[PDB]
Design a protein around this ligand. Structure first.
Ligand SMILES: Cn1cc(-c2cccc(N3CCc4c(sc5c4CC(C)(C)C5)C3=O)c2CO)cc(Nc2ccncn2)c1=O
Length: 265
């Protein structure tokens, strides 16, 4: 794992707080934009993360928010990542909702699907894919962020499937019932993400509680077709929500489906 010298980091701006505490914007060696997570003590299974972190860093793709390296020879430890000037996709969708062409929406889906196909090819699970966990750069490219980190979270409200922070609305039945994560639970989440994109950042199952969502999707309830989604596009997101995991497509197939819709237009 790349151990970055904290002396090479210059903090510039507060970016707010996430599950592991404060995140800042800064530069590495006076030139490269980076984000720096300052890992709050007690928020992360740190020994576990450090022991397992090299695989995460070796993940390299244009549509992933890259994990560059770590600073572990001090307290608190740092995680250093690629910086994305336009912030998280969920806010981006909401703030420009009157400006998007539908072709731009499909392109966001393509971006995320490319990232997820790559992770799938590495047998690497995201485990918390959602618009809130995608970021947007200065040229409008969407990238997937914080893949794999859900595993190291110490927060019972997040790790319990009946916790108030658990991503119930992005979870398939087998995750809610058995905590069975697989590439196919990332597939389900991706479908919900597509719905978030085409709904311009609406909350899935708004007005339903988490437990009501779990209850009803287990009984077959599915998100409705957003007004901006064509039938071809809705067919793609809907295919991600087969009750049976083994009936859901791969990200390779989804990518091929999305490319086909793009060509046709
Ligand atoms: C890389 N990066 C991270 C952030 C940023 C800033 C504050 C907080 C966070 N989050 C939010 C999401 C998140 C963490 S850790 C973690 C999650 C989900 C999880 C439960 C699985 C584990 C986090 O660190 C992030 C995303 O990692 C903001 C950026 N950009 C901007 C730009 C302008 N304004 C604000 N942010 C940016 O480029």
């Amino acid at each position: 794992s790349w151990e970055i010298d904290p002396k090479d980091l210059t903090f510039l701006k507060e970016l707010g707080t996430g599950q592991f505490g404060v995140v800042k914007y800064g530069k590495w060696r006076g030139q490269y934009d980076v984000a720096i997570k300052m890992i709050k003590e007690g928020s992360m299974s740190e020994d576990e993360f450090i022991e397992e972190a090299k695989v995460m860093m070796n993940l390299s793709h244009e549509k992933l928010v890259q994990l560059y390296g770590v600073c572990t020879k001090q307290r608190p430890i740092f995680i250093i990542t690629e910086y994305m000037a336009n912030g998280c996709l969920l806010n981006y969708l909401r703030e420009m909702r009157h400006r998007f062409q539908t072709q731009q929406l499909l392109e966001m889906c393509k971006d995320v699907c490319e990232a997820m196909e790559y992770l799938e090819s590495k047998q690497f699970l995201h485990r918390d894919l959602a618009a809130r966990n995608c970021l947007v750069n200065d040229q409008g490219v969407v990238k997937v962020s914080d893949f794999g980190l859900s595993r190291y979270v110490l927060d019972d409200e997040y790790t319990s499937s009946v916790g108030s922070k658990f991503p119930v609305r992005w979870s398939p039945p087998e995750v809610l019932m058995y905590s069975k994560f697989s590439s196919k639970s990332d597939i389900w989440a991706f479908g919900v993400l597509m719905w978030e994109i085409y709904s311009l950042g609406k909350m899935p199952y708004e007005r339903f509680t988490n437990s009501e969502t779990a209850e009803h999707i287990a009984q077959g309830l599915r998100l409705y077709r957003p007004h901006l989604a064509s039938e071809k596009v809705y067919t793609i997101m809907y295919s991600c929500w087969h009750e049976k995991a083994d009936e859901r497509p791969t990200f390779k197939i989804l990518l091929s489906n999305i490319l086909d819709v793009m060509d046709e237009n």
